[PDB]
Amino acid sequence: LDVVPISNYRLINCNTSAITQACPKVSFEPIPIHYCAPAGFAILKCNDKKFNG
Amino acid sequence: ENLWVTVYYGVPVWKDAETTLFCASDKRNVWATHACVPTDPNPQEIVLENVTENFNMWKNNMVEQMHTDIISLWDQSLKPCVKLTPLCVTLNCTNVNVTNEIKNCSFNITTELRDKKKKVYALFYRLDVVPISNYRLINCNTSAITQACPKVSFEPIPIHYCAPAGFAILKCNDKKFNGTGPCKNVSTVQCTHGIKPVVSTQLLLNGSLAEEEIIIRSENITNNAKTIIVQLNESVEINCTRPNNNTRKSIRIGPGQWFYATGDIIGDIRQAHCNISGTKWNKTLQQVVKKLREHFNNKTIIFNPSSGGDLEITTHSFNCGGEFFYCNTSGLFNSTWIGDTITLPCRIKQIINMWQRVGQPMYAPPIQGKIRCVSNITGLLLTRDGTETFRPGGGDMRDNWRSELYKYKVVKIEPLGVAPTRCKRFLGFLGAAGSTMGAASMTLTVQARNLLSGIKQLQARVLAVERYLRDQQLLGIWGCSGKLICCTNVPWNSSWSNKSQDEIWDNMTWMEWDKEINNYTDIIYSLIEESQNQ
Amino acid sequence: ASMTLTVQARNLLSGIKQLQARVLAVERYLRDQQLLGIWGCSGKLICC
Numbered sequence: 288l289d290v291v292p293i294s295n296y297r298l299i300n301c302n303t304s305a306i307t308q309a310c311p312k313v314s315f316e317p318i319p320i321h322y323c324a325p326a327g328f329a330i331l332k333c334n335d336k337k338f339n340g
Numbered sequence: 341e342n343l344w345v346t347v348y349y350g351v352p353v354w355k356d357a358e359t360t361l362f363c364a365s366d367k368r369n370v371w372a373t374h375a376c377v378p379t380d381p382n383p384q385e386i387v388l389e390n391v392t393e394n395f396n397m398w399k400n401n402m403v404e405q406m407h408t409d410i411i412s413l414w415d416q417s418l419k420p421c422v423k424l425t426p427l428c429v430t431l432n433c434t435n436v437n438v439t440n441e442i443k444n445c446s447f448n449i450t451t452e453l454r455d456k457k458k459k460v461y462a463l464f465y466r467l468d469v470v471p472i473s474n475y476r477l478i479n480c481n482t483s484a485i486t487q488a489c490p491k492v493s494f495e496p497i498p499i500h501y502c503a504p505a506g507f508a509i510l511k512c513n514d515k516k517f518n519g520t521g522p523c524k525n526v527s528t529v530q531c532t533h534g535i536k537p538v539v540s541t542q543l544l545l546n547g548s549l550a551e552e553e554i555i556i557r558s559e560n561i562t563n564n565a566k567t568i569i570v571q572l573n574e575s576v577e578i579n580c581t582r583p584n585n586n587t588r589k590s591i592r593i594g595p596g597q598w599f600y601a602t603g604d605i606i607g608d609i610r611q612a613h614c615n616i617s618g619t620k621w622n623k624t625l626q627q628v629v630k631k632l633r634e635h636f637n638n639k640t641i642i643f644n645p646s647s648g649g650d651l652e653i654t655t656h657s658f659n660c661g662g663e664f665f666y667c668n669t670s671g672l673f674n675s676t677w678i679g680d681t682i683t684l685p686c687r688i689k690q691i692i693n694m695w696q697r698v699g700q701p702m703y704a705p706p707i708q709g710k711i712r713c714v715s716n717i718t719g720l721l722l723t724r725d726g727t728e729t730f731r732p733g734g735g736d737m738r739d740n741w742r743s744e745l746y747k748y749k750v751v752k753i754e755p756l757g758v759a760p761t762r763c764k765r766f767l768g769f770l771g772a773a774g775s776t777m778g779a780a781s782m783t784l785t786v787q788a789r790n791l792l793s794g795i796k797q798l799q800a801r802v803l804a805v806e807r808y809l810r811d812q813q814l815l816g817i818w819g820c821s822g823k824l825i826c827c828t829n830v831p832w833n834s835s836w837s838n839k840s841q842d843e844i845w846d847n848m849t850w851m852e853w854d855k856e857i858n859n860y861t862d863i864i865y866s867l868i869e870e871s872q873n874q
Numbered sequence: 875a876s877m878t879l880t881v882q883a884r885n886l887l888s889g890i891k892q893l894q895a896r897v898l899a900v901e902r903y904l905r906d907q908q909l910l911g912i913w914g915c916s917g918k919l920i921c922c
């Protein structure tokens with residue numbers, strides 16, 4: 288899936304852009320992110336169990 | 341008698357100052373990077389009655405501010421696109437199929453694969469190519485050439501410069517104002533009119549016109565080292581065209597990197613040119629000369645073509661439709677003055693070096709199809725040679741911007757002041773500047789509210805807050821931390837001022853008062869503080 | 875020492891690292907002034 292035919296083949300994105308490899312030491316495992324309110328603001332949370340959108 | 345110092349905050353006085361202005365405006369235009377806010381659809385202007393202000397357009401720092409911002413918008417716009425470093429190869433240039441100034445050059449380039457090369461052809465203008473397998477691009481031994489990002493338009497968009505909190509822009513409304521000296525009709529504006537960043541050399545295009553007569557202005561009209569800006573009260577149309585039907589060709593240089601080359605020319609090979617009516621130009625010169633003899637004695641005046649040097653100086657350059665033209669104006673500046681259509685040939689360049697910066701060339705991709713644009717000559721830039729001799733010229737862009745910013749001055753508001761009173765412990769912003777002290781003191785909230793109203797903007801905003809707080813801290817120390825009018829216990833010294841209460845409150849303005857006691861404010865401020873501690 | 879309070883109060887106001895330092899100095903000043911306003915004497919250096 289990463290290789291396309293054109294001494295037969297080319298990497299799939301060489302006619303579109305530069306490919307950056309991921310840093311080998313960098314994990315992609317998600318870490319929970321908390322968003323917090325700035326001064327002058329508040330975040331309100333809805334606690335209704337059956338609340339939809 | 342029994343007069344006491346009273347402190348007033350929000351007093352409509354000011355002093356000259358420099359600051360950082362913000363823009364305001366109203367795809368991907370090179371002048372619309374959106375670093376600045378949208379304009380107010382109904383900007384205000386307040387005429388200040390009885391205000392005389394000394395202006396000097398040659399010392400104006402709004403000019404330096406504009407010049408720096410223009411360079412940055414340009415440079416930011418050229419960052420996200422293709423470098424032409426890969427084209428610095430030997431070119432094989434001939435004239436086999438173009439004419440019976442444009443060369444047909446072949447060269448080798450890489451493709452998206454690093455192990456493969458192909459031979460390609462492109463047309464280049466002679467001015468962009470220099471001889472050394474015969475030729476080289478003109479800047480390959482100096483620097484890297486960046487092509488203009490192809491979707492970016494160079495068409496000017498008016499830019500408004502607006503004042504930050506604590507500052508005001510004053511405008512001079514005198515119809516005959518040349519650039520220096522007192523202006524007897526001064527108005528305060530939230531901001532400037534839109535100024536179009538039009539780039540040109542010998543002739544100023546698409547600017548503002550004078551209203552009554554041609555205005556000839558210079559820093560020193562008797563020097564030779566200073567330029568003369570001539571503002572016309574009538575426009576002269578200049579019709580410019582690029583008659584060759586160029587084809588754009590797209591060459592792949594790298595992995596998503598395209599180069600735009602000129603492909604075959606369709607039809608005849610013709611010279612670019614500009615058309616100026618003969619009679620309008622002559623009327624313009626009769627008027628320019630008539631007003632020039634008002635500064636010079638009744639001498640013969642001659643106009644000559646510029647003396648020489650770089651093409652960017654000797655020709656009239658401009659950006660028309662996105663192409664860069666260099667027109668020969670020797671057909672205009674060639675006459676003697678004593679007591680049909682003009683056709684100017686032009687050259688086109690693709691590799692240019694704007695704002696006289698050596699080492700930062702840009703490649704303008706060709707524009708497909710024919711180009712035509714109509715511009716308004718609204719002024720001239722003239723220089724005196726060592727009978728008086730004048731030549732067109734000056735490639736320093738600040739002289740173009742001085743022709744639009746000459747009416748504006750930036751001042752800093754100085755809201756704190758004192759005056760003797762008998763107490764003992766809507767015009768708009770600065771509208772009361774021309775009012776007497778006893779009337780102006782009733783509109784203090786108007787100025788106090790205007791003290792609060794990227795990095796350069798954060799610095800300006802942080803500083804405005806710090807200035808506000810320092811004045812509030814001072815008032816808290818003296819007493820009356822919450823008041824705009826604060827009565828103190830310091831008796832008034834007739835030696836600071838021996839004017840009566842009616843002379844001070846009914847005749848004088850705050851601006852004049854500020855001068856009368858200018859040498860005593862450090863004494864008065866110390867007495868106010870010392871008396872609070874007792 | 876209580877007779878030279880203005881000297882220190884005036885020294886509370888006197889790139890990114892500098893903007894952060896300056897914004898913070900302003901915030902610290904304002905928090906102390908807000909506190910005094912709550913206690914009373916918002917404009918005084920000596921508050922009984």
Ligand SMILES: *[C@@H]1O[C@H](CO)[C@@H](O[C@@H]2O[C@H](CO)[C@@H](O[C@@H]3O[C@H](CO[C@H]4O[C@H](CO)[C@@H](O)[C@H](O)[C@@H]4O)[C@@H](O)[C@H](O[C@H]4O[C@H](CO)[C@@H](O)[C@H](O[C@H]5O[C@H](CO)[C@@H](O)[C@H](O)[C@@H]5O)[C@@H]4O)[C@@H]3O)[C@H](O)[C@H]2NC(C)=O)[C@H](O)[C@H]1NC(C)=O
Nearest residue numbers: 495538545546658659660661662707708712713714715716
């Ligand atoms: C002083 O002030 C003068 C007046 O403002 C200026 O003159 C004016 O200059 C502008 C810009 O050069 C001229 O505007 C251009 O006119 C071209 C021709 O338009 C005509 O034909 C159109 C056909 O559809 C028609 O719709 C128009 O109504 C008109 O009849 C335009 O093609 C050109 O368009 C550019 O901007 C478009 C923005 O959306 C963009 O879409 C266009 O893309 C086209 O071209 C590119 C080129 O690569 C192709 O890649 C695209 O695929 C597509 O083909 C293009 O980028 C623009 O509107 C204006 O006409 C002219 N006025 C006069 C009277 O001639 C002076 O120049 C100022 N002086 C100085 C020194 O600046």
Ligand SMILES: *[C@@H]1O[C@H](CO)[C@@H](O[C@@H]2O[C@H](CO)[C@@H](O)[C@H](O)[C@H]2NC(C)=O)[C@H](O)[C@H]1NC(C)=O
Nearest residue numbers: 290291292293294295296297298453454455456
């Ligand atoms: C691509 O790889 C193939 C792999 O088979 C090469 O084909 C033959 O590979 C065998 C392996 O022992 C060699 O002995 C043959 O001599 C190769 N064929 C030829 C004609 O030499 C193939 O040549 C490789 N091609 C490239 C461009 O590397």
Ligand SMILES: *[C@@H]1O[C@H](CO)[C@@H](O[C@@H]2O[C@H](CO)[C@@H](O)[C@H](O)[C@H]2NC(C)=O)[C@H](O)[C@H]1NC(C)=O
Nearest residue numbers: 288290291292293298299300301302303304596
């Ligand atoms: C770069 O090369 C790729 C691979 O050939 C092109 O992707 C193909 O584009 C065609 C267009 O019709 C599609 O039908 C194919 O299915 C695409 N192939 C793959 C693997 O997705 C791509 O379009 C080329 N890019 C450019 C800019 O030419």
Ligand SMILES: *[C@@H]1O[C@H](CO)[C@@H](O[C@@H]2O[C@H](CO)[C@@H](O)[C@H](O)[C@H]2NC(C)=O)[C@H](O)[C@H]1NC(C)=O
Nearest residue numbers: 384385386387388512513514515524525526527
């Ligand atoms: C002083 O300058 C002001 C500002 O330009 C002039 O006021 C303008 O006068 C015209 C005349 O009709 C009005 O249309 C504008 O709306 C006015 N502008 C403002 C902001 O009020 C004023 O006329 C000039 N006075 C003199 C004596 O020249």
Ligand SMILES: *[C@@H]1O[C@H](CO)[C@@H](O[C@@H]2O[C@H](CO)[C@@H](O)[C@H](O)[C@H]2NC(C)=O)[C@H](O)[C@H]1NC(C)=O
Nearest residue numbers: 430431432433434435436444445446447473474
């Ligand atoms: C540069 O271009 C010229 C173009 O004329 C080449 O000169 C001759 O071009 C004709 C065109 O049909 C060929 O048939 C000849 O054989 C070319 N001459 C030679 C000696 O081959 C010229 O050779 C080109 N040079 C390079 C380095 O590309």
Ligand SMILES: *[C@@H]1O[C@H](CO)[C@@H](O[C@@H]2O[C@H](CO)[C@@H](O)[C@H](O)[C@H]2NC(C)=O)[C@H](O)[C@H]1NC(C)=O
Nearest residue numbers: 467469470471472476477478479480481482483
């Ligand atoms: C890079 O090459 C250019 C082109 O040859 C040089 O520019 C020439 O410099 C000489 C110096 O006397 C001038 O007389 C020529 O008129 C210049 N040519 C053009 C087209 O302007 C340039 O000096 C070279 N730069 C370096 C660093 O060697």
Ligand SMILES: *[C@@H]1O[C@H](CO)[C@@H](O[C@@H]2O[C@H](CO)[C@@H](O)[C@H](O)[C@H]2NC(C)=O)[C@H](O)[C@H]1NC(C)=O
Nearest residue numbers: 517518519520521522556557558559560561635
């Ligand atoms: C623009 O107008 C101003 C104001 O009249 C001129 O300034 C005066 O110039 C004369 C020249 O001898 C001086 O004596 C006056 O003292 C100047 N007045 C002020 C207020 O400075 C100025 O020279 C004119 N500009 C040009 C290019 O003529």
Ligand SMILES: *[C@@H]1O[C@H](CO)[C@@H](O[C@@H]2O[C@H](CO)[C@@H](O)[C@H](O)[C@H]2NC(C)=O)[C@H](O)[C@H]1NC(C)=O
Nearest residue numbers: 545546547548574575576577714715716717718
């Ligand atoms: C070039 O000058 C002409 C006038 O000679 C300008 O045309 C008119 O300008 C007035 C200015 O108030 C407008 O009210 C008219 O509506 C304009 N005419 C038309 C047909 O719109 C022309 O706009 C000037 N061009 C530039 C670029 O400033």
Ligand SMILES: *[C@@H]1O[C@H](CO)[C@@H](O[C@@H]2O[C@H](CO)[C@@H](O)[C@H](O)[C@H]2NC(C)=O)[C@H](O)[C@H]1NC(C)=O
Nearest residue numbers: 398520558559560561562563564565566724726
């Ligand atoms: C405007 O320019 C004139 C002409 O250069 C200046 O007058 C000269 O001043 C120098 C000063 O050393 C004298 O040596 C010259 O003899 C003067 N020339 C004449 C013709 O008198 C004038 O001072 C300049 N004015 C300003 C304000 O810069």
Ligand SMILES: *[C@@H]1O[C@H](CO)[C@@H](O[C@@H]2O[C@H](CO)[C@@H](O)[C@H](O)[C@H]2NC(C)=O)[C@H](O)[C@H]1NC(C)=O
Nearest residue numbers: 583584585586587604605606607708709710711
């Ligand atoms: C400049 O040349 C182009 C290309 O010849 C002309 O645009 C059209 O191109 C298509 C391509 O197939 C032809 O089928 C059309 O017939 C061409 N136009 C016409 C009117 O024939 C373009 O029109 C030329 N520009 C000018 C001003 O003549």
Ligand SMILES: *[C@@H]1O[C@H](CO)[C@@H](O[C@@H]2O[C@H](CO)[C@@H](O)[C@H](O)[C@H]2NC(C)=O)[C@H](O)[C@H]1NC(C)=O
Nearest residue numbers: 577578579580614615616617618680681682714
């Ligand atoms: C520049 O172009 C403009 C418009 O394209 C010309 O203006 C026209 O001039 C003719 C002369 O007979 C008039 O009949 C038209 O009514 C004008 N058009 C407009 C819109 O006003 C102008 O004359 C050209 N200038 C030159 C030097 O050729």
Ligand SMILES: *[C@@H]1O[C@H](CO)[C@@H](O[C@@H]2O[C@H](CO)[C@@H](O)[C@H](O)[C@H]2NC(C)=O)[C@H](O)[C@H]1NC(C)=O
Nearest residue numbers: 645648650651653654655667668669670671685
């Ligand atoms: C602008 O055009 C004029 C002529 O239209 C050029 O002047 C000629 O320059 C050559 C150069 O050697 C002289 O031999 C001619 O005698 C000049 N003609 C006249 C009438 O004097 C002028 O050099 C061109 N300027 C630019 C900047 O290209």
Ligand SMILES: *[C@@H]1O[C@H](CO)[C@@H](O[C@@H]2O[C@H](CO)[C@@H](O)[C@H](O)[C@H]2NC(C)=O)[C@H](O)[C@H]1NC(C)=O
Nearest residue numbers: 643644645646668669670671672673674675676
């Ligand atoms: C300025 O205009 C004059 C005429 O108005 C030009 O004079 C011409 O000079 C050439 C030089 O060889 C003569 O052959 C012509 O016969 C002259 N014309 C006339 C009518 O006498 C002069 O050259 C122009 N200057 C420039 C720089 O172009």
Ligand SMILES: *[C@@H]1O[C@H](CO)[C@@H](O[C@@H]2O[C@H](CO)[C@@H](O)[C@H](O)[C@H]2NC(C)=O)[C@H](O)[C@H]1NC(C)=O
Nearest residue numbers: 387388389390391767771772773774775776779
């Ligand atoms: C500018 O000066 C004029 C003249 O002194 C002021 O006009 C006077 O305003 C007062 C206001 O009470 C009137 O009582 C006078 O009768 C007016 N004088 C005349 C001759 O009409 C004008 O108000 C001043 N402008 C400002 C903003 O105060």
Ligand SMILES: *[C@@H]1O[C@H](CO)[C@@H](O)[C@H](O)[C@H]1NC(C)=O
Nearest residue numbers: 290291292293294295296297
């Ligand atoms: C690879 O090259 C060989 C050469 O004959 C050809 O037969 C084969 O079909 C090619 N494969 C691809 C994917 O191009």
Ligand SMILES: *[C@@H]1O[C@H](CO)[C@@H](O)[C@H](O)[C@H]1NC(C)=O
Nearest residue numbers: 430431432446447448459473
């Ligand atoms: C391109 O490379 C080939 C390789 O032999 C060479 O013969 C040709 O002359 C080169 N073209 C140019 C214009 O240098």
